[model samples]
Target: LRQCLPCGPGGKGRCFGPSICCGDELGCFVGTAEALRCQEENYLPSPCQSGQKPCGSGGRCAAAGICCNDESCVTEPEC
Candidate 1:
């Protein structure tokens, strides 16, 4: 992850998380870029258990199977 940017001129109550926003502008541009890089290099399509959601925003479920979004690939055998 990239270092977060300085907040707005007032630096009050800035939102911080997966992506941070300072005032009206993004505080960091590297997270998305890094995610894309990881996707390009390591993404593999596979069937996930039922009821599972896709990992991250740009991820996809393979062959009509559910995609998992949790840290671990599978939550349950049947999902």
Candidate 2:
């Protein structure tokens, strides 16, 4: 996945656990059952880089258009 932009500037916030980036308007989320469901439901489009796959469940999406396995948004999984 491509490196994502930082959270706040993009109106986003980092999830506390599991590291999924979500819209700031949605408020901080814990990696709970409903929270996990919202991760899928509230997913923004183009959440990953061009030609790259999005992170799997419990993965990172620390900004608008990229997927990562951690806050760095650099360690992408194999497509």
Candidate 3:
């Protein structure tokens, strides 16, 4: 007694049990698209000046400055 319905046109439909269908395809697709867009924008290099680094580990560097500790460059938002 399982039933599956497509979320929309050109969508993949699937069934699991007696009364369940994967109807969140549209939502999943939209969420994934948004995530990809955000990733593409957020992980890009900073426009910092040459020889300078970008902010990292939730620390903001001075203008045209790089955020680094005494050891190495800080590129991630967390340690």
**Most accurate candidate by TM-score:** 2
Overall lDDT per candidate, in order of appearance = 0.26, 0.39, 0.27
CA deviation > 4 Å runs, candidate 3: 1-11, 27-79
Off by over 4 Å in 2: 1-21, 38-79
Work out the TM-score per prediction.
Answer: 0.16, 0.23, 0.18
How do the residues 17-46 of candidate 2 rate in per-residue lDDT, one tens digit apiece? 234444425433334332343344235554
User: Deviation in angstroms for 63 in model 3?
Assistant: 44
Candidate 1 lDDT by residue in tens digits, 1-79: 2222333334431222223222222222223432222232223343222122234333222112322221222222221
Alpha carbon deviation, residue 16, candidate 3 (Å): 0.8
lDDT for model 1: 0.26
Task: For residue 53, give model 1's deviation from the true position in Å.
Answer: 24
Give the distance in Å from residue 53's predicted Cα in candidate 2 to where it truly belongs.
Answer: 20
State in Å the error of residue 31, model 2. Answer: 0.5
Q: What's the distance in Å from true for residue 48, model 1?
A: 30
Q: Please write out the lDDT profile of model 3 over residues 1-79, one tens digit for every residue.
A: 1122232235442222122222224222223322232223223354212112335543333112233321233334321
